[PDB]
Amino acid sequence: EEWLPTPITEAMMKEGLSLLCKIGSGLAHAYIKLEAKDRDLTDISLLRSYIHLRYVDISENHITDISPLNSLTHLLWLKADGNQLRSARMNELPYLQIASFSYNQIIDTEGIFHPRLGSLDLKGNRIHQVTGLDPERLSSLHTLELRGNQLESTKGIYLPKLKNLYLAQNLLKKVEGLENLSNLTTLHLRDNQIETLNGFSQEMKSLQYLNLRSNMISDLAELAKLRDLPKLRALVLLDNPCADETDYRQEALVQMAHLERLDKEFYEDDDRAEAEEIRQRLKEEQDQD
Amino acid sequence: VAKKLASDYGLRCLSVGDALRGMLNNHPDSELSLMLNWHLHKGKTVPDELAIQALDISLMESVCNTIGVVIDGYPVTPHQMDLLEARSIIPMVIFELHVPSKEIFKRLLLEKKTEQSMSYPLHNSSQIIAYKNAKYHKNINEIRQF
After folding, report:
1. CA distance A252 to A237
2. B136 chain-A contacts, CB cut-off 8 A
3. Which one, A52, B12, B43, B80, has the greatest CB density within 10 A?
4. DSSP-assigned states of every residue in A64-77
5. Distance from C-alpha of A122 to C-alpha of A27, rounded to nearest angstrom
6. Is B75 annotated for ligand binding?
7. H helix count then E strand count, chain A
8. Is the peptide bond before B75 cis (omega within 30 degrees of 0)?
9. Which residues of A touch B42 (CB under 8 A)?
10. Residue B92 C-alpha, separation from nearest chain A C-alpha, in angstroms
11. Buried b / exposed e across A184-216, counting CB within 10 Å, b at 16+?
């Protein structure tokens, strides 16, 4: 927008390059870290000479592209948050264990393919939707963070490798479709908006915990539904309209005894002994059928 | 095994990186440190002469110099073996470990368990590991023969 051209020189490499380790051949040795987070940087052309890193942070810079890194996949992790990037259009990386590109100019999910990334963060990006999300080739992607993102359709996030996803504060007028991702272990809709289920079931069997803070939820009949999950043990409904219901947390403890936690608060365990009597009352109502 | 030896009778073992790293602290602007930096910034990963010097410098280290040192997995090339002989860095005795790939992979799966024992990211690619091991065979055969 206003920046000086900011390539880089030996001097920066002499400061940044650090941690000396024996290279991908297991023969010679190399420095493994780079550090030029914020120097108004724009260009990486010198960096090409140092293919052997495992770790870099260069977040909060004016860097617009890193495509030469596609030659250098032996890196294990990169952080470049805040930078000017628009999508992950890199090669399908065989080693980039982790990355983050939060607060970037990123819009979508292009190039998100890497077999050997496990965790990704992208909060405060401009992301709106799935644009290709391979169930298999992302063979290690276990974690994605996306807080605040501008998100849209959430079907097609069909990534069995993922454990947990965080679309908290994301602008999702509705969410949708998780049932097939059995490895799904946690979701936050913390500070989100929604009022009814959108294709969720016990088939997300690994799902232990869901946050729905500030969502529209009111009808505790939903407590009948995702109760079906075999391992869900925690929820949040804090600040939802259902917090005005006279039982609410109580009724939720009736609906799921192993609801250990709600609303930043582990349950009153002796109120589980209460809720067992209340479950008896429910069964006396229900077993009239 | 190297560590077990080092502990059990206070012996030394060295990797090349150990010396180079020591040099970085012992004087970051020594001749060898200056060359090392210059090469690193050129991307010249350890021109062997540097390691050779660092190693014989390590022989200065009194514990080793008087008592005992072992070196692990080094040289990695015949060319290094030759230049070591040229200085005459020359072990009295050499031992070699022959191992099925199956065992290596099983150990690596236990290392995978250790990765949860660990936490910070680390390079764990069995694929690279296999490549390196194969090239270890390639060079070690010639090195052994000589």
Report:
1. 10
2. 26
3. A52
4. ---GGGGG-TT--E
5. 36
6. yes
7. 4, 13
8. yes
9. 49
10. 23
11. bbbbbbbbbbbeeeeebebebbbbbbbbbbbbe
